[PDB]
Every structure is written in structure tokens, then in C-alpha cells.
Amino acid sequence: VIVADIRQAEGALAEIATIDRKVGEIEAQMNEAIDAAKARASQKSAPLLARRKELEDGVATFATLNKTEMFKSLDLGFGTIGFRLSTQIVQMSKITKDMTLERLRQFGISEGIRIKEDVNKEAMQGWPDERLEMVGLKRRTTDAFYIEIN
Amino acid sequence: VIVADIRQAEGALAEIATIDRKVGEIEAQMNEAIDAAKARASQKSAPLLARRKELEDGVATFATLNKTEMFKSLDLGFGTIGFRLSTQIVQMSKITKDMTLERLRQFGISEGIRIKEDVNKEAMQGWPDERLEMVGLKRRTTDAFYIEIN
After folding, report:
1. Could you tell me if B125 and B77 lie in one domain?
2. Do residue A64 and residue A88 come from a single domain?
3. How far apart are the first and last CA of chain B?
4. Which residues 102-141 of A have a C-beta within 8 angstroms of B?
5. What domain of life does the UniProt record list for this protein's source (chains A, B) (predicted)?
6. Domain that residue A145 falls in
7. Secondary element (H or E) of residue B143
8. Which of A119, A142, A115, A123 is CA-nearest to residue B91?
């Protein structure tokens, strides 16, 4: 396209604003198709997963109440049941994860700590250009074109 | 449900494995409905957004080539066009964001730095219970029931 004068811009920005209105409504129909699918899926499978619970439980009390004689891992053809040992490391009772860090740090244990550092671009903003230059940063100042539909 | 004997478990784990097979196929149909919607949406709007580009550009060269006389922000009824000043702070040319941090830190500027610390649960794992206790951590050891379909 070639926009040779002010009327021809006016033109373009009516078309553009027609596309925005079209597109943005293509994207309403998709979110109705997707909305509907998520709703069918979850409609049909809520009762199946309710039933799977009852049964899952079911076998559970049975396998505990009968535990001592019965087991490792009893094969049931359709799959295995049984008991497994999972160790997890967790906070002590009244101790937050930040208190564990400060302790790791009081004791000098840096292997205990995971750090992710980042530059604070907002204390930066109120610096002069020279202070930025010393920390390896520059203000990039753009004059950019904007079409801005109503 | 009440699973009073080994045959009745066998029962349950055939049903369960039927649900898993049903559900997990409800969830294939949804991802075909959603797959299809994302594909219609993006089919109809690829040409509309191609056209929006041509026009967007279009007005752009026109507004630059004609810049000095023409502008702030010319109103076109359907919306505004023009030029705006956006300042952004960015890395200097051969300087990574980690070198800017180390510099911030060489100079003692802690306001420049954003930290997010975290406990390394993997150096933890090879600790005795007592070392954990001092940093406020405990090994929680669970014996859990597992039904595990084939």
C-alpha cells in the first residue's frame, strides 16, 4: 500500500479498525469453541473420576485393614497394588523457609542456598547517564510511530 | 464401595483401568475440538493480520516521509496517529546483565539488585537428621498406598 495524503490515511485507519473488530471477534468464537469443549470434557468425566475415587479408596482401606499378612507389591493382573516409601524434606513446625535460609547463612552453608539475582531497572531510571555507564547500562531513547484506534 | 477380598480388588482395578482408558480419551476429543478451533481462528485471521500490516506500515512511511510539517498527534476520527517518546534502559554493547550485577556489587549498590533466595533441597538430602534439625528442617518419611495400572 502507498498512503500519499491525509484522506488516504483516514482510509487505512478505517480498514485497520475494521480488521481489529473482525479479528477480535474471530477470537471470541474460538474461546466459545474452546469454552464448550472444556465444558463437555469435564461434564462427562466428573462422574467417571468420582467413581474412580470410591474404587481407589475402597481398595485402599482393604489393603491397609489387611496389611500385615498381605504384603511388598501384590500383582493383580490389571495392575499392581501395595505400599511405597517416599522420603520428603520439609520445614519444622514453626519455622518458615526464610528462617531456614538465614540459618543456612548464619552457619556459612552456601551449598544450601539457591540464588537468582536480577537488575532492578527501577532504581536505575532515576540515575544520570554516567552512573549508568559505569555499571554497563545505557538509556536508549526511541521516537516511535503510533497508530492508536479508538 | 467395600473391597472384602482379593478377587474384589482385581474387580475394582479392572474398572479403574476402564475409567483411565475412558477419561484419557474424553481428553483426546477435547484436544481435537480445541485443536480445531485454534486452527480455524488462525486460518481466517492470518490474511486479516497480513492486511493490517501493509496498512499499518503504509501509514508509517507516509507519516515519517511527511514528518516535520505534519506533527504531536494528528486525529483521524477513526483514531490517532503520530510519534511518541519511550525511554528504555538497556545493556551496553559488550556487557551482559550478570556483569552489570557484579559491578553493582563491586560498588556496593544493593538497591540496584533484585534477589530471590531458595533452599536447595538436594544438598539437604545427604544430611543427617541433626544437621537438618539445626537449620529447621525434618525428614518426613511416608509409607503410602499405591495402585499402579499397567
Report:
1. yes
2. no
3. 22
4. 103-104, 107, 109, 111-121, 123-125, 132-141
5. Bacteria
6. 72-150
7. strand B137-145
8. A119
